[PDB]
Design a protein around this ligand. Structure first.
Ligand SMILES: Cc1cc(C)c(B(c2c(C)cc(C)cc2C)N(CC(F)(F)F)c2ccc(O)cc2)c(C)c1
Ligand SMILES: Cc1cc(C)c(B(c2c(C)cc(C)cc2C)N(CC(F)(F)F)c2ccc(O)cc2)c(C)c1
Lengths: 233, 10, 242, 10
């Protein structure tokens, strides 16, 4: 209700505030990597990241206005996406690599220990270099996260749409503040939102051979990761 | 009642 | 270079680049089975694909790309493009989906194909979305050419690969221009323009999801050997598994 | 190479 009257700037501060930190991984650089150990570290990483995410979500303006079921659904649809945007962002300053954790920065040929990974690796790296060349901003980054959350599932169908129009407003505000022409603001808004398509696609691919990387049981995946994974497919 | 269900109410 | 086009010129060249609506193998003389349904849609698509290449070649800037880049994008977007095309078709047919004027389906006629109804309802919702936003023919074409140029843009080595990507980004920037120019002419507030633009492009990620799940079942069908795919349709799939 | 061929057509 009261989320709709948040000004552009109360929403920017509101999101930067709710930002999860960057986690370390159960990582022993002694043991080389296999399919098993490589899945060990990421599901451990993402397991923990999931818990911050759930809490992040609730500080997403207007999110707690949705009935329990709605909130479940969105997180069930966007979790991997959000993981992947976050990962692409902290991987920005490291070309050719992927900063899973500060202690786990991976390059391309290490996605080979797991089949189907390397391909998603290339897509992520690609997005990372799109973020770089576009010079995405922290304040822009958290808005996209908000969009992903609220758009992955998408009176009750209106509320979220209003919030979505608020985040657009906000994104626009930031490009305005940066000193962009009306023609640059609209072009960048388009370039931002089309990256989301790609993120969606990355999320769908990972879900595929992570539903089969569950059958081909190379690693235990927590009860939550399974829960998230089974209601997606 | 679902892992993700209770973690949103905690 | 097609950068040198006004918004108007962009629209016209897209509206007359448009592919023709095709018909399904008509008078069906057999009840619907999973095999039969999937034969109608697969025959349809396979024929639609030939005119998509044609339509693609006529999307400003597309031809300025090199063959492998053109293959990549088309290989990447064919089913999204098919599905937006569908959604548009079924515009004035609420609760139905006009795959062809003589194949107008509602949701109970997906009940037989593992995975259909689910995908069907998403496509139904999108139709509702467009109706509600009253998407326009001139916006529609812009959306679809976005999907073409955007879906495989990222998926870089020396300025040949690099400058090739500034190029489709120019072209894409143009479609944005021309999308706002359309929204303004329809007399929308500048605040409504950026909100409209955003909502429209957000549906593009729902289309992506459409295609991906559709591709998934399309693979499941192939290996279950339910329907005989064309050689072209064989390669369109095999790009999404390699 | 069906796709590839088809685009190569003048
Ligand atoms: C619990 C879990 C979650 C993910 C998203 C991943 B994967 C994943 C990968 C890499 C490959 C396959 C074949 C399957 C998965 C799930 N993943 C994909 C990427 F590396 F390709 F990008 C990932 C991304 C971000 C993150 O914070 C944690 C993991 C894994 C291995 C385990
Ligand atoms: C060659 C081919 C291509 C598509 C997209 C489809 B499917 C498709 C269907 C119906 C179900 C499954 C499980 C998978 C697919 C690919 N399809 C899905 C929908 F109807 F559910 F939306 C479709 C969409 C647009 C179009 O012009 C033609 C067909 C089929 C059956 C065959």
């Amino acid at each position: 209700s009261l989320a709709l009257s948040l000004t552009a700037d109360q929403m920017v501060s509101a999101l930067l505030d709710a930002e999860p930190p960057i986690l370390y991984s159960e990582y022993d650089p002694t043991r080389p990597f296999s399919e098993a150990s490589m899945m060990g570290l990421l599901t451990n990483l993402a397991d923990r990241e999931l818990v911050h995410m759930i809490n992040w979500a609730k500080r997403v303006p207007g999110f707690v206005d949705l009935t329990l079921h709605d909130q479940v659904h969105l997180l069930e649809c966007a979790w991997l996406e959000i993981l992947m945007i976050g990962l692409v962002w902290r991987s920005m300053e490291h070309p050719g690599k992927l900063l899973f954790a500060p202690n786990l920065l991976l390059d391309r040929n290490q996605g080979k220990c797991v089949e189907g990974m390397v391909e998603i690796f290339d897509m992520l790296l690609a997005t990372s270099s799109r973020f770089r060349m576009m010079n995405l901003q922290g304040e822009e980054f958290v808005c996209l996260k908000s969009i992903i959350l609220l758009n992955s599932g998408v009176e009750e169908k209106d509320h979220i749409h209003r919030v979505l129009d608020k985040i657009t407003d906000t994104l626009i505000h930031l490009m305005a503040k940066a000193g962009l022409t009306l023609q640059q603001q609209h072009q960048r808004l388009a370039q931002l939102l089309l990256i989301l398509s790609h993120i969606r696609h990355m999320s769908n691919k990972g879900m595929e051979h992570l539903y089969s990387m569950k059958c081909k049981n190379v690693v235990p995946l927590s009860d939550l990761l399974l829960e998230m994974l089974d209601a997606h497919r | 009642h679902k892992i993700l269900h209770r973690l949103l109410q905690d």
